[PDB]
Structure formats: C-alpha cells, structure tokens
Amino acid sequence: MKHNNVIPNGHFKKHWQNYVRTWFNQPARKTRRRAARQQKAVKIFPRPTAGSLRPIVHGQTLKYNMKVRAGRGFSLEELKAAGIPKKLAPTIGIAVDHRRRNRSLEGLQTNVQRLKTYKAKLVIFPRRAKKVKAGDSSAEELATATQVQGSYMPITREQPAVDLVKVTDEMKSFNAYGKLRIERTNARHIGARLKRAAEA
Amino acid sequence: RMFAPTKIWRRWHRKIPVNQKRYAVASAIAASAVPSLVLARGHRIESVPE
Amino acid sequence: TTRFKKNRKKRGHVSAGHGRVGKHRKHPGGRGNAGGMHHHRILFDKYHPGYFGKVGMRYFHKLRNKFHCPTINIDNLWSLVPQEVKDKAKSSNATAPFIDVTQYGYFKVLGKGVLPQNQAVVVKAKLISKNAEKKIKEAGGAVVLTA
Amino acid sequence: GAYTYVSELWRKKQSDVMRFLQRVRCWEYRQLPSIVRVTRPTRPDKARRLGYKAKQGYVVYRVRVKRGGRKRPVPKGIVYGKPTNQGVTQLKFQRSKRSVAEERAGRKLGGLKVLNSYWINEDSTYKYYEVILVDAAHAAIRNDPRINWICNPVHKHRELRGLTSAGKKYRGLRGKGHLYHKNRPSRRGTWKRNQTLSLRRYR
Amino acid sequence: QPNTGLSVGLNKGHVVTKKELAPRPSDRKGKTSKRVHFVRSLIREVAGFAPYEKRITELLKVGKDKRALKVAKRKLGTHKRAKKKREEMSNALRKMRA
RNA sequence: CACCACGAGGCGCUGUCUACGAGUCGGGUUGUUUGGGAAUGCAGCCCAAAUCGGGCGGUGAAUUCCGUCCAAGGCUAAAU
RNA sequence: GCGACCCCAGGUCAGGCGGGACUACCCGCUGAGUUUAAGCAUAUCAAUAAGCGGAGGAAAAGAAACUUACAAGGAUUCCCCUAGUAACGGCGAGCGAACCGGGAACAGCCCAGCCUUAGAAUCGGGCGGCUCCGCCGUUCGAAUUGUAGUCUGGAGAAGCGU
Ligand SMILES: [K+]
Ligand SMILES: [K+]
Ligand SMILES: [K+]
Ligand SMILES: [K+]
Ligand SMILES: [K+]
Ligand SMILES: [K+]
Ligand SMILES: [K+]
Ligand SMILES: [K+]
Ligand SMILES: [K+]
Ligand SMILES: [K+]
Ligand SMILES: [K+]
Ligand SMILES: [Mg+2]
Ligand SMILES: [Mg+2]
Ligand SMILES: [Mg+2]
Ligand SMILES: [Mg+2]
Ligand SMILES: [Mg+2]
Ligand SMILES: [Mg+2]
C-alpha cells in the first residue's frame, strides 16, 4: 500500500470466481417473459391483462406514508361495506386480503369507492349462455366486450398545486419554532411531570 | 494453460448516455444532407436529383 | 485498450519498468492493509487520522427511514412555485403563494439565503428553523405546521 | 369426546399414574429391539393430531435411540488442526434425536413413507419415539385425497431431506421473521444468494 | 386519542379519524370452552399435583411466599410464569381451606 | 337434448355457545453457528408451562400500559 | 377340553412396495488445512474443498405465533436498491445481513379435537357384470383403542328470515 488513497476493502478473499452471475441471458429472459404474458392474455381472454383489481394503500414508515401504492387485496371490512361477498370477489377479478386491518375511515372509504367503481365498470358473462342470473350482464353489454391491455384503474397521486391565500393576523402571530420546541420539551418531560403529579 | 485465461465476465458492453446517442444520431442525419460528405463516404450520387 | 498500455512501450527493456535492483516481487510489504500500526504507521497517521479506535454509542438494528428528513432552504422555495403562480403572486399583493414543501418531498425548511424582495410567502412544513421562520415573518408571510 | 381427556392426562407426566405407566413401558421397551412394529399407537390422540388414521396402509413403529451428544469420531481423540477445532467431547449433533429415529425407521423400511413421529418415553440411556409410516402403494392410501400426495415422487425419503416436522424444526424453519430469515429457502441457499457477485451487461 | 397533526410532541402524526378495529375470531385465542375447563378440572383431580407444585404449596402453607416464588421461578424459568403458578397454588390452598 | 333445489352455499339478525396441536413452548447450562452485540438459529443434558392465556416488539431486570400475531400437524402452481 | 381376545412365530401362501445408476442445478449431514493477518494461537481461508446420504424437471420455501411504530403494510420465491450500511472483529487483518421503496410472478387451501347413535352413513380384497385411469351388485375383511360427514379462528355451531 502506498500514497494517499482510500483504504481498500474489497471482499474478494473467497472462491468468488465460482459465484459470478453474468447477465448474457437478459434479452432472452425479456423475450420469455413477454411470451408468457402473451400466452396468459390469450388464455384469460377477455379478462383484463393487468390482472385482478388491487386496493389503494399507504406506504410504510415515515419515509413513505405520504405515498399511495397498490396493496395485496381488499380487506374483509371493505368487501362487506361494498356489498361484495368475500367468496365471490376472487372469481370476478377482485383480490381479497383477509389479513389487512382497517384503522382509519379514509382508507376504508377510498377502497369502498374503488370497489364501487369496479362494479360499475364490470361486465359478467353468464355461466350458461341461455341462462341469465342475478349478477350477469345484458346481451347488449356482453356483445361490446373487449380485453383491456393496460391498467384500467391507475393508482395516481394528486399532483401538487400552489394557491394564493390571504395571510391573516392569526397566522402572522404564530410562532412555529416555539411551538415545536415546547412540544418536544413536553414529550421529553411527560414522564417526570406524571411522576411528580402522582407523588403530590 | 495460457497466461491470464480469457473469462466471460469481461466488460463486453458499454453504457453511453442517451443524450450523447441522440447527439450522434442528429449529427449523422445532418451529415446525410451534405452532398460532399455523402460523396466522401463512397456513395455514387452524381445522378440524384437533389 | 491494449495497444495504449505502457507495457507495450516497455517490450524489450528487460525489467518492464520495475527496476533491476528492487524488482517486482509478490507482496514485499504484506497484503492489503497489513502493518497499519507497525511498518505502514506513517502512511495511516498522515493520510488517515482517526482510523484506529472506536468512539460513540452503538445502535443495534438502526433503521434509516425513521430518521428521514429532507431539507430545503428559503432561497430555493421560490423555485418550487410554477411560473404562472409566480406571475400571479407578482401581480397581486393582497395574497401570497402557499407552498407545501412536503408535496415536493421536503420535511424541514432551513434558512440559508434570501427570498424575493417584497414578496409574502406562506410556507407549510413539518419543521422549520428559527432563522427561516424569522425571514418568512419579515417578508410578510406565515408558517404552518403539518405532519 | 375422549381424546381431550387422554391429551390432558398425558400433559401430566409427573403424576403418579403416568409415572407408573411410563416406568413399566420403559422397562418393557428396554428388553426389545431398537426398531419394532407396534400393532396400534399407544398415544391415539397424538397420532390423530399428527395425521395418523385408523385405516389400512397406516403403520406405527417404535424406535429407540441413544441419548447424549456427538463425540467427534476421530481415532484416539486426536485432531490434526488448530486449537479451535481440537475439541472432541461436548460437541452436539445438529439434528434432533427424533430426527434420528425417523431416519432409522425410513432407512430400515425403504418400502414405506415416513409421515410424522412423536415422543413416547425416555430413560437416562435411551429415548423412544413412534414413527407413523404410510404404505403409498395401498389402494386405501391412493384413493384418499388427504394423504395420496405422499405417493408423488417428489416426497421420496422426506425424513432424509429434513422435510418432516422434526426436519423443519432442526432446519430452523419453525419460526419466521428477523430471528429466522437466514433459514429460508435454506441456509446454504441464502449463503449462495448473498455471496453471488452480480456483473450485469451494462456496468 | 386523535393525532394532533404535528410531527413532534405527544399524539403526533397525520390527522385521521381513527377507527376501532372490527372484531375478529382471533380475539378469543386465550379462551377455551367450558367443556375444556371441566375436562381439565377432572384430569387434575385424577392426576394430582407434581412434586414441585407440592413443594410450593408447602411453602405457602408455612407462609414463605417469597421462597415459594423463588422456587417457582427456578422450576419454571421466568418470573411471570412463577407468579402465575404461585397464584394458582394460592387459589388451590384457599379452596382447600374453605 | 333433459335441465329435478330435498339439500348445500350466499346475505341479514341473536341477551346462546364458540372446543384451536406438551417432555411442546419457555428457562438454565454446554457446544457450534450468526452481523445478532448480558447471548441469531440449531443441538445435547437439567427443569418444565399456560388458557380473561401464549410468542414477538434487536441492552439484561422489576412494575404499569400499548402494538402485533397465534407455534409445537399437513398440501400447494408462477416468477428463480 | 372348548371358546373369545392379546402379543408373537412359520409360510416358494394371494397381490403389491424398496435397494442401484447419473451430476450442471436442488435438499440434509459431516467437515479441514494451504492461505491472510508481513510472525502466531482467537479470527481469516469457510458455515468452503474433501467425505456420507436424498429428489425433480426444477428442487427448496410458502399462506405470519410476520414487517413495523407509519396516514401503517400483508403467503413464498427472485431481481434492483437498501449497502460495503446497522452490526460483528487480538474493534487488527477483515467480515457483514434485514425492513421500507421499485419491479418479475401471483393462489390459495386440507386436517386433530364437543357435536350420526333412529344402527360405519367409511374403506380394502375376491367373484360377476358395465358406456372400464372408473361405476354397479354380492360376499369376506378393516374399523368403535373411530372410517365417513361438519369445523380450522379469515371463522364456525344452533335458531329465525331473504
Ligand atoms: K492517490
Ligand atoms: K515503473
Ligand atoms: K533498478
Ligand atoms: K456502545
Ligand atoms: K483458527
Ligand atoms: K379447533
Ligand atoms: K395451529
Ligand atoms: K438449550
Ligand atoms: K401480547
Ligand atoms: K366391498
Ligand atoms: K373428520
Ligand atoms: Mg519499494
Ligand atoms: Mg483436521
Ligand atoms: Mg416442492
Ligand atoms: Mg451509497
Ligand atoms: Mg419488496
Ligand atoms: Mg369391491
């Protein structure tokens, strides 16, 4: 070792040459996955190629709680609120997740509205052609039925907007930094304050 | 055995920025419009109308 | 590019540029960072002060997400406002633009630099520094806390 | 409606009744070979809850295994290596005794399939287990949808690949999460995945 | 308690209308039927108590509650299970006295 | 072309019930292993549970709460 | 002496099953030292080589006794990132994951236990038929020390309505 260089820490002391993974098959993998997707689309025709509907869920942890993404499946509470029996939802293209809990009204209401939109946009063929049942669609709707290729219900964020508002005296007399400092102090000293209150 | 036997994990490919690729494509397209350059590249264009 | 390698220029010069006396042997000073305290001590001390020893407390299973806190300076707040909103704010002095820095991925607002002259700005953020709040108040704006 | 009584009684292993019965049974087992068939399970309820059924094609074998750790089997206890590896005694087999019993039953009974096993008795020198095996060739087994999966070739010698309940236990698979993640899909598979040096085309 | 809408202090976080969790069958994991309790009582009558349970009961009869708890902790392994076992022994002793 | 809803599921209600895996979990100790650090998993030996309970919440311990799941039985295609 | 059961013994009894072979990948066990540390013993080499076994076309894993502390995610597997990071380490040489986030693919289920008792409703073998990977009839046997059916916590039983 010589000169002023960063201290090296290369992890190459084992038989690493026997565990090298190359990517010469990357185009082949892409082609194989595309072929599988095409075969699946042909198989499930006329069902949408994007797959079953998924719920809207929040991101985990403080880093992503402002983000909205797709969850595994709709909760039992959401299905009950939307009037869709849980045993029927999977058969009509709705994913079901019996594990997800509903802690707030906003998420439950959002997913219920999503399910209602899907129901409004859903067309169901009868099990037997000559027999029409409660959940089946009319012949006119069935005739104009096609396979949807892309995502039929994109999960998108409401883009930010900067509006002009009046600055009132109440806002001009608010000490944000002082509020933050006092809240931090209260959080730090809650235990001591409770102990003193209990003692006295 | 040869000295330093060749191995498959040699860096065969190159990752050129997209902007540079587009620059090169635009330059080639512009050069294709210069009759002198087209002649200089070996093409017989003495009979092309324009 | 093999044809540009300097060993090609050294073909026919015996030592290949590594000297007749010293030569190029296998590991004359040990492997890797060997001897950091004994025969490579001068190099470590002069170029890598602080390398040896330990300081501070440990933190088992430390997750970086709970420490996430992007910051933006007040001198960059105006750049978040779209051009049409900036024009509207310039035209009308009775209202101020309302910038939610959280929608742009910022948690805390710091107080480096200055704002546009004679421009009131309403800023909402999770946290703010005392200087940033003072500058916003001086500009005629206000601060709103969110989460 | 009787199995709960038996299970609760077998949870009271320090009771006088259980101590007497287990003492007599341990004496009797000591006199017989290490592997022997039993006409019916001596713990019916435990066998049921482990998948046994009272129908043709199901059998139970009692297996006796020696107790204690694994002495390193080197001549004269001599190790040619560094001091860290010089230990001979106080070394422990990575597999459990019940896994050993299941392996012995499976190797001895090559024409059957090991399903599960349970502890029955133990003394200072021996530990005893009964192994539930299935004759996959029997028509009763092959016509039962709940068990005929064992007839498929992928389940050959489950006990020798750690696929039994004891196998999953000693492979570290009975838990999930931060305390067990390195065990899935397998410890060696995880090591191979972690050590792999990925060199993409565009680096 | 609802979130304050602040990022610091007590009850911090984004403001949402909290919803009580819907009841689910898993709320009864620690409970069992009356038949199971009856069976366990009968089997306890049939099988009696283990020697260490008898030792704890003797210690409680003498009046050495701390020694009984120490013995229970040594036998079972944890202070919580030792406390539970000592309480159960005390309940059995109370039933015997009455 | 016959297409039969006895029965079984779907939905709503209930001052009733609501059964869930033991020498297993857990604990002590020893050996090994792990990034897992008053001990990550595994294993031997010793002790050895519970049902308004049990496991986990990356610093051991006691007290009071809170969050989250339900082990010790089993099967399962695809992405690799 | 007869009979019932239990445990066990002998059958070239009627009909079935198993051993062994291959190595690129896969599963379980066992297990070094060369080497690096400019010496060397912990460490490293390596949870690797060698050794002993077990499968398939993939294997293994898999439906939370999970992740987290959020406005919360939701079987397993794999890729990118996390990250040469938290941590470990004669804190030397070195070693080194996981969660979130973005993608590929997606699928959920079966049992044990209280619950036929107006009758084991279950299953195997022989024999005889049939539209023969199975169905029907008859006869022996297994099984009550429990085969079918319902139930599996996401529930469910029972009762009443649609
Ligand atoms: K340099
Ligand atoms: K040189
Ligand atoms: K020289
Ligand atoms: K520390
Ligand atoms: K060593
Ligand atoms: K149950
Ligand atoms: K269970
Ligand atoms: K132990
Ligand atoms: K708990
Ligand atoms: K028959
Ligand atoms: K059943
Ligand atoms: Mg030199
Ligand atoms: Mg050796
Ligand atoms: Mg498999
Ligand atoms: Mg980085
Ligand atoms: Mg992910
Ligand atoms: Mg027949």
Short mmCIF file of N, CA, C and O in Angstrom, two decimals, chain D residues 1-6 8-12 14-17 19, chain E residues 35-36 38-40 42-44 46-53:
data_model
loop_
_atom_site.label_atom_id
_atom_site.label_comp_id
_atom_site.label_asym_id
_atom_site.label_seq_id
_atom_site.Cartn_x
_atom_site.Cartn_y
_atom_site.Cartn_z
N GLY D 1 -65.11 -37.65 21.95
CA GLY D 1 -65.16 -36.81 23.18
C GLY D 1 -64.21 -37.26 24.26
O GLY D 1 -64.19 -36.70 25.36
N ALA D 2 -63.41 -38.29 23.96
CA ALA D 2 -62.48 -38.85 24.93
C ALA D 2 -61.04 -38.43 24.72
O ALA D 2 -60.23 -38.53 25.65
N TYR D 3 -60.68 -37.95 23.53
CA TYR D 3 -59.29 -37.64 23.23
C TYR D 3 -58.76 -36.49 24.08
O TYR D 3 -57.58 -36.47 24.43
N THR D 4 -59.62 -35.53 24.42
CA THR D 4 -59.18 -34.42 25.27
C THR D 4 -58.74 -34.92 26.64
O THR D 4 -57.75 -34.43 27.20
N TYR D 5 -59.47 -35.88 27.21
CA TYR D 5 -59.07 -36.45 28.49
C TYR D 5 -57.68 -37.07 28.40
O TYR D 5 -56.82 -36.85 29.26
N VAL D 6 -57.43 -37.85 27.34
CA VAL D 6 -56.14 -38.50 27.18
C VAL D 6 -55.03 -37.47 27.01
O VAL D 6 -53.95 -37.60 27.59
N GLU D 8 -54.98 -34.31 28.06
CA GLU D 8 -54.75 -33.63 29.33
C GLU D 8 -53.99 -34.52 30.30
O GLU D 8 -53.08 -34.05 31.00
N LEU D 9 -54.33 -35.81 30.35
CA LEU D 9 -53.60 -36.73 31.22
C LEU D 9 -52.14 -36.84 30.80
O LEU D 9 -51.24 -36.84 31.65
N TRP D 10 -51.88 -36.92 29.49
CA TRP D 10 -50.51 -37.00 29.01
C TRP D 10 -49.76 -35.70 29.20
O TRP D 10 -48.52 -35.69 29.11
N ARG D 11 -50.46 -34.59 29.43
CA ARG D 11 -49.79 -33.37 29.85
C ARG D 11 -49.34 -33.43 31.30
O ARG D 11 -48.53 -32.59 31.72
N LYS D 12 -49.85 -34.38 32.08
CA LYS D 12 -49.45 -34.56 33.48
C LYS D 12 -48.48 -35.73 33.57
O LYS D 12 -48.83 -36.83 33.99
N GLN D 14 -45.77 -35.91 35.45
CA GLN D 14 -45.24 -36.09 36.79
C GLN D 14 -46.26 -36.67 37.76
O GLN D 14 -45.97 -36.80 38.95
N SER D 15 -47.45 -37.02 37.28
CA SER D 15 -48.45 -37.66 38.12
C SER D 15 -48.07 -39.11 38.41
O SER D 15 -47.35 -39.75 37.64
N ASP D 16 -48.58 -39.63 39.53
CA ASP D 16 -48.23 -40.99 39.93
C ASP D 16 -48.67 -42.01 38.89
O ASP D 16 -47.91 -42.94 38.56
N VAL D 17 -49.88 -41.86 38.35
CA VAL D 17 -50.38 -42.79 37.35
C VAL D 17 -49.45 -42.81 36.14
O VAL D 17 -49.03 -43.88 35.67
N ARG D 19 -46.34 -41.77 35.93
CA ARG D 19 -45.01 -42.26 36.28
C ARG D 19 -44.99 -43.79 36.31
O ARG D 19 -44.07 -44.41 35.77
N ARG E 35 -66.38 -26.89 28.37
CA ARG E 35 -66.09 -28.32 28.39
C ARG E 35 -64.61 -28.57 28.63
O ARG E 35 -64.24 -29.50 29.37
N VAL E 36 -63.74 -27.77 28.02
CA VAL E 36 -62.30 -27.95 28.23
C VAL E 36 -61.94 -27.67 29.68
O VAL E 36 -61.12 -28.39 30.27
N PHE E 38 -63.91 -28.08 32.26
CA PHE E 38 -64.42 -29.22 33.03
C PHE E 38 -63.48 -30.41 32.91
O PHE E 38 -63.15 -31.07 33.91
N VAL E 39 -63.02 -30.70 31.69
CA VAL E 39 -62.12 -31.82 31.47
C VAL E 39 -60.81 -31.61 32.22
O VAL E 39 -60.27 -32.54 32.83
N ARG E 40 -60.28 -30.38 32.18
CA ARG E 40 -59.03 -30.11 32.87
C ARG E 40 -59.18 -30.25 34.38
O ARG E 40 -58.30 -30.79 35.05
N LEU E 42 -61.33 -32.23 35.92
CA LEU E 42 -61.44 -33.65 36.21
C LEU E 42 -60.08 -34.34 36.13
O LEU E 42 -59.75 -35.17 36.98
N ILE E 43 -59.29 -34.01 35.11
CA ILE E 43 -57.98 -34.64 34.97
C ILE E 43 -57.05 -34.20 36.09
O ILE E 43 -56.20 -34.98 36.53
N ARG E 44 -57.17 -32.95 36.55
CA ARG E 44 -56.39 -32.52 37.70
C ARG E 44 -56.77 -33.34 38.93
O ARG E 44 -55.90 -33.76 39.70
N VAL E 46 -57.92 -36.38 38.91
CA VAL E 46 -57.45 -37.75 38.71
C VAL E 46 -55.94 -37.84 38.93
O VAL E 46 -55.45 -38.77 39.57
N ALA E 47 -55.18 -36.87 38.41
CA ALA E 47 -53.73 -36.98 38.33
C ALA E 47 -52.98 -36.30 39.47
O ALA E 47 -51.80 -36.59 39.66
N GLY E 48 -53.63 -35.41 40.21
CA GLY E 48 -52.96 -34.75 41.32
C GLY E 48 -51.99 -33.67 40.86
O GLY E 48 -52.10 -33.11 39.77
N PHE E 49 -51.03 -33.38 41.73
CA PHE E 49 -50.08 -32.30 41.53
C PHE E 49 -48.66 -32.84 41.44
O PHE E 49 -48.34 -33.89 42.01
N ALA E 50 -47.80 -32.11 40.72
CA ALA E 50 -46.41 -32.50 40.58
C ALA E 50 -45.64 -32.22 41.87
O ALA E 50 -46.07 -31.42 42.70
N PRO E 51 -44.49 -32.87 42.06
CA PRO E 51 -43.74 -32.67 43.31
C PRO E 51 -43.38 -31.22 43.59
O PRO E 51 -43.45 -30.78 44.74
N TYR E 52 -42.99 -30.45 42.56
CA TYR E 52 -42.63 -29.06 42.80
C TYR E 52 -43.86 -28.21 43.13
O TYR E 52 -43.76 -27.26 43.91
N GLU E 53 -45.02 -28.55 42.55
CA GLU E 53 -46.25 -27.89 42.97
C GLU E 53 -46.53 -28.16 44.44
O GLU E 53 -46.95 -27.26 45.18
#
